[PDB]
Each structure stands twice: as structure tokens, then as C-alpha cells.
């Protein structure tokens, strides 16, 4: 059986899997967030892509479709038809809840770019059915990439909250076949996130469960998941010291025992590398990071 | 010890290494193109990055710096100083010659985006010295990504030519420590390029030497290059048939002997077969 590995690369060199952004820190969620249900950045340890997750960052947080001035009818990024009533959205479709999106729209064969402003809360935002509001985008075929975010237009006065996913469905029907929620299974554990700075009018930090380069590594390697959890060390490349032990679970996420938001994984330097140690029990008791 | 491998992934799922774009075809260069000197998408087979090439697509074709309204003083993408007279440009800096750039500029802590229009021909375009003309971008710190391209502003009337790289230096000083040029090896071999459609007012196709996901793979694996060239098969995942043999050379590029590679489907996987002589004669595709 092909042994399980993670890339031999420092975190500071890798990308977020929910937007095309460099990784800037390791984080944990606020205490009111115990589970997440991101649709991008979802890959099992044996390399199975889940939700809207693509293999490549060139598909991450992008849209493709044709505006008629009222709606944008979505396709996959390469132009392939997207069928409604099947999944949350096309592959790579942005999954940042709790914000308005500002998508930079360009066209094959035409000059210029256009800022497309997306409130994800109205009933016209229905990517599960292949359609989202045009909000002023003129008729034409476009490809767009998320460029910056801002506070949600609704509810009035709410804050940016990137721990959420958008409402892919509507009053007509709920979206189906979402990637399931992930939660920390072990004693005292919390989910671990890879954070990126996101442009926009605040100090926005976008969390994801796995760097995009881990995803393409796993999707290629497809190492059989022969244990309940993968024990990992976060290794300092200067000294070789183990800065903390972590567990990666088969569904494709990491946990740790923090010993604190003010002293724990968030204070770890970002120049380190995650290294597989051995397969351990789902209930292996991790030593606190900080 | 570590065996050489390439990712077990179909080409159509991977990205260009000169811009964050999906791969849409395999191409070869026109006959008037005798060498290429791309600065992004340059990685040896044992994982050494060359030119401005980053590990990750999140750095590809991006800029970072502070405008004073006259110039943009460039930094690395994370803000680290970029010193003059050392390399062509910061890591990830766009390397598309033969066109004007239109870069989407955003800011940490501020609303809005701004289109930054870059003519790479004037004497104020000197990324080798750490600065390029602001061309109207107001004062502030920005991060930018290449969004679309158009024909170069100078010489007037010239066409887009993505086989070129920009002029990183100036009339006073040539840029130094560029990734070296790549040349066709001979024996009827031609360089193989991975192509992407680039937005803008034409049918633009952007060539690169390696998909970005190959680069992060090699940079991680760092398999010793124990032969002169790596013989590869391009495999059809439906039938398992070999669609054509290729050679990957240590400096980080592929060739074949070409109706040829440009008509190959993009849903195949490149698979390492064995190490061979640099003068190993390939069967025509």
C-alpha cells in the first residue's frame, strides 16, 4: 500500500483552498463555532474530492456563465453545462458565507473587466438551480474570480463571518448533496484552519481546512487510509523541533488541543512543515500545542 | 533513492504556470520562435525553482507594492522588501511579454478594485530595480493580479505575442539572474507547451513549460535526476493506451517528435517510464 504523506513544503509557500490567496497564519475558530461545512477545500485523506472542491487553484472561487441582464445562467468553468437540482453549485464556485462578494468579470474575446456585486442572501441567488442575479451585469458570457469582500447587504448591519457558507438554495427548494459538516472528534480537540488575508474594508481572515496544494497532492497520491487518524508533527525547519502534534482525520481536516487562542496553534510560525508520523486511534490524546 | 514521478492527475484538471488559468490544450511554438525564456513556470526535475517561479499558483502573475502616484515600489507578495540589481522582478511577477497588462488592484483594509494598465516598454518599467510606473494608480498599498491583456501600446500596431517576456531592465542596465533560455534540442524534437485561454480582445493562448501542479509536486518530491532525460508516456485514462512518448529534460521542460501534440486530447496523464539518454530517439506522436 502506498504510504500516506503530506507535501514536503512550508505552509508559508502554499495557498488557501477557498480563494486564490497565500497562507498567512494557522488559526482556530471562535468558541461559538464548533463545526464547519465549507464546500471548497474538501478532500479526503485518500484523495476523494467533495463538495465543489477542484483539483487546481485555477478553479477556486470562480464563476462562469451567461448574463441576460436579469440572471447569470451558470456553466462549469470550462463551459460544460451545469445541471440544476444536483449539487450546491458548479465546481470551484465560491463558498464564502457571511459577506457580499465582489467578483472581477472578464470575457474571452473582449476588452475590459467589470465588478460584479453578489449579495448571497436573496431568493434570486440560487446556484443549486444554476442561476444567480445579474445585478446590473450586461448581457454576455463571462468568467469571474472573487477579488474582494465586504459586509453582507442583509441582515442590515451584520459583520463579515467567513466561518459560514452561502445559501445555495432558495424558498423554492433547499440545495442537495452538500459536502457534510466536520467536527473535532477527540477529547479537548478543536478544528485547525489555514488562514489567508482577504482584501476588502476590514481585517478579513479567510479560514480553510486544507491548503490547495495538499488537495492536489492527496488527489494524486491516493494513499489508502489504513488508520483512524493520521498523527502529524508541525516541524520547525530551522531546528527540526516538533512544534506540536496534530491529528488529520480521514474526512480531510486537522485538529489539535490548543491550550489557548492566545497561546497555542495560532502563535505557531507559518514557515513550518506538517509531517506524517503514524496512524493512531481516533481517540489518541494530543498534547496541548501551547 | 526517491523515484522520479509526475502527478497522477489529468492535464485538463491542472493550471497554467504563467497565469492562474486552466489548461485547455497542448501546443507547439511557431517557426519564428527559436527559443523561450519564461521566468515563471521554471522548475528543474529535482525541484529547484528558477526565475521568478513560485511554489504555489496563489503567487502567479501577481504584484504587490506601494504607489506614490508616480511609481509603484514593488515588494514581494507578503510585503518583504525587493532589492534592486539582484533578479528580474519579485517572485510571481507577471512574465507575459508582447502585450499590455491589465491588473486588478485591491487593498487590505479598503473597499474597491482598480484596473491598472501596464505598458511594459517604457524606461519607467524597471522591475529589476524594484519600481514600475503608476500610470494613474493613486497613492496606497495594493495587491494585484493579472486580469486580462491587450495588444502592446508600443510599437504602435503590434500584435499580442505571448512567446516573449517583458523588458525587466532598463537602457542603463540589463536585468540579471534571469532563468536561462530554453532551446529545441534537435532530432526533430520540439518543445511542448501547456496552453490556456487568456481574456482580452482577441483569441489569446498563453503557453507555459509545466503545469503549476507539476511544479509544486517536483518542489516537494525533490527526486534525484539520475538520468539525462525522463521518457514519459501520455496515457489515455479511458483505454489505457499510450498516446505518445515524450522526454522531460532536467532543466524542466518536455519535448516530443510531432497532426501532432496539438491535436492530443487534454484529459490524459503523463507517466514516467524510465531514464534515457539525452539523445534517445522518440517515436513520432
Amino acid at each position, epitope marked *: 500500500t502506498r504510504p500516506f504523506t503530506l507535501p514536503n513544503l512550508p505552509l508559508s509557500s502554499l495557498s488557501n483552498s477557498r480563494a486564490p490567496l497565500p497562507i498567512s497564519s494557522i488559526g482556530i475558530s471562535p468558541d461559538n463555532v464548533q463545526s464547519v461545512q465549507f464546500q471548497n477545500g474538501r478532500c479526503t485523506l*485518500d484523495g*476523494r*474530492l467533495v463538495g465543489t472542491t477542484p483539483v487546481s487553484l485555477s478553479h477556486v472561487a470562480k464563476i462562469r456563465g451567461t448574463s441576460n441582464g436579469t440572471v447569470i445562467n451558470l456553466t462549469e468553468l470550462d463551459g460544460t453545462p451545469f445541471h440544476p437540482f444536483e449539487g450546491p453549485a458548479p465546481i470551484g464556485f465560491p463558498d464564502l458565507g457571511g459577506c457580499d462578494w465582489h467578483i472581477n468579470m472578464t470575457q474571452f474575446g473582449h476588452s475590459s473587466q467589470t465588478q460584479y456585486d453578489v449579495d448571497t442572501t436573496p431568493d434570486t441567488f440560487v446556484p443549486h438551480l444554476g442561476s444567480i442575479q445579474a445585478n446590473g451585469i450586461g448581457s454576455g458570457n463571462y468568467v469571474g474570480v472573487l477579488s474582494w469582500i465586504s459586509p453582507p447587504s442583509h441582515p442590515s448591519g451584520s459583520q463579515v463571518d467567513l466561518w459560514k457558507i452561502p445559501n445555495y438554495g432558495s424558498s423554492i427548494t433547499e440545495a*442537495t448533496h452538500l459536502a457534510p459538516s466536520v467536527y473535532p472528534p477527540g477529547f479537548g480537540e478543536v478544528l485547525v484552519f489555514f488562514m489567508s488575508k482577504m482584501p476588502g474594508p476590514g481585517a478579513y481572515n479567510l479560514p480553510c481546512l486544507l491548503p490547495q496544494e495538499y488537495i492536489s497532492h492527496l488527489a*494524486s497520491e491516493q494513499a489508502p487510509t489504513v488508520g483512524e487518524a493520521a498523527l502529524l508533527h508541525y516541524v520547525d525547519p530551522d531546528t527540526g523541533r516538533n512544534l506540536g502534534e496534530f491529528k488529520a482525520y480521514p474526512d480531510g481536516f486537522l485538529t489539535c488541543v490548543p491550550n489557548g487562542a492566545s497561546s497555542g496553534p495560532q502563535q505557531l510560525p507559518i514557515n513550518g512543515v506538517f509531517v506524517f508520523v503514524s496512524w493512531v486511534s481516533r481517540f489518541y490524546q494530543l498534547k496541548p500545542v501551547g | 533513492t526517491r523515484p522520479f514521478t509526475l502527478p497522477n492527475l489529468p492535464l485538463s484538471s491542472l493550471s497554467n504556470s504563467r497565469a492562474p488559468l486552466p489548461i485547455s490544450s497542448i501546443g507547439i511554438s511557431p517557426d519564428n520562435v527559436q527559443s523561450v525564456q519564461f521566468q515563471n513556470g521554471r522548475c528543474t526535475l529535482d525541484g529547484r525553482l528558477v526565475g521568478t517561479t513560485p511554489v504555489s499558483l496563489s503567487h502567479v502573475a501577481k504584484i504587490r507594492g506601494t504607489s506614490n502616484g508616480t511609481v509603484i515600489n514593488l515588494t514581494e507578495l507578503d510585503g518583504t522588501p525587493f532589492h534592486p540589481f539582484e533578479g528580474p522582478a519579485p517572485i510571481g511577477f507577471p512574465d507575459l511579454g508582447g502585450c499590455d497588462w491589465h491588473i486588478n488592484m485591491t487593498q487590505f483594509g479598503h473597499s474597491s478594485q482598480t484596473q491598472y494598465d501596464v505598458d511594459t516598454t517604457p524606461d519607467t518599467f524597471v522591475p529589476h530595480l524594484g519600481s514600475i510606473q503608476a500610470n494613474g494608480i493613486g497613492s496606497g498599498n495594493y495587491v494585484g493580479v493579472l486580469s486580462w491583456i491587450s495588444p502592446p501600446s508600443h510599437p504602435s500596431g503590434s500584435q499580442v505575442d505571448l512567446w516573449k517576456i517583458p523588458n525587466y531592465g532598463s537602457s542603463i542596465t540589463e536585468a540579471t539572474h534571469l532563468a536561462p533560455s530554453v532551446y529545441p534540442p534537435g532530432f526533430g524534437e520540439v518543445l511542448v507547451f501547456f496552453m490556456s485561454k487568456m481574456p482580452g480582445p482577441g483569441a489569446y493562448n498563453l503557453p507555459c513549460l509545466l503545469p503549476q501542479e507539476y511544479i509544486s509536486h517536483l518542489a516537494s518530491e525533490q527526486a534525484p535526476t539520475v538520468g539525462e532525460a525522463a521518457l514519459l508516456h501520455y496515457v489515455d*485514462p479511458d483505454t*489505457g493506451r499510450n498516446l505518445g512518448e515524450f522526454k522531460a529534460y532536467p532543466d524542466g521542460f518536455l519535448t516530443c517528435v510531432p497532426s501532432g501534440p496539438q491535436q492530443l486530447p487534454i484529459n490524459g496523464v503523463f507517466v514516467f517510464v524510465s531514464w534515457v539518454s539525452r539523445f534517445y530517439q522518440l517515436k513520432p506522436v
Partner: nanobody
Amino acid sequence: QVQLQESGGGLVMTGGSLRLSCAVSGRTIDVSVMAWFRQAPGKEREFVSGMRWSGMTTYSADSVKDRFTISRDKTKNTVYLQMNSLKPEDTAVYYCAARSRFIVGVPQARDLYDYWGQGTQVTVSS
């Protein structure tokens, strides 16, 4: 995430025919292989027939190669198993299975498939 739902099982007399169907829903864009397996009492699960979902290659086990045919519906995301000249030894629970991870060819190992249906009983009486 991919959902599989089989139908069409039941009782058939020896020598008869039966067509199983499996509805594939969810993330079908990068499903690469669809297959049928079967598990008889006191025996291990066995590969029956498989196809490249968007390709043309198929493969059937030697015990059924001249009698069973796998195919994809031209309109809907449904895979079929056409079973002809059924024998009592064909009695089993038949399972639909999907492979999404990239692979060359049609795998026969059960542990390489990514998604499984709930199974449908086929009984061949003599």
C-alpha cells in the same frame, strides 16, 4: 458527494432476463467509473461489470461476460446492468458502485470504489 440508488431486482426464473438500474446523482461531473458488484450468501463481494462513465471502455468478469452488459442511459445519469440467461448461481445482492478519484481503466477491486448503493436482491429460481 455522489448518491446511488438501485432498482429492478426481484425474482426471475432460470434462463430469464432482468435489467437492473442505478440512478447517479450529486457530483457526477468527475465520476470516472461506474460498476456493478454482487455478494452471494457465504461468499465475498465480487466485481461483475464496469464502464468508463464518460468513455467507451467496459469490462465484465469472465463468469458473466457473455450474458451481462453494462451501459449508460443516453438521456439521464443512470447506469444499467442487463442480465440475460440468468442461472441460480447468479442469485445475490447486486450493488451499484461509483469511482470519482482519477484512475486509468476500469478497476475491479472493491476497495478502489468511492461510493456504493444499498444493494438490490436478485433471486433466480429453477
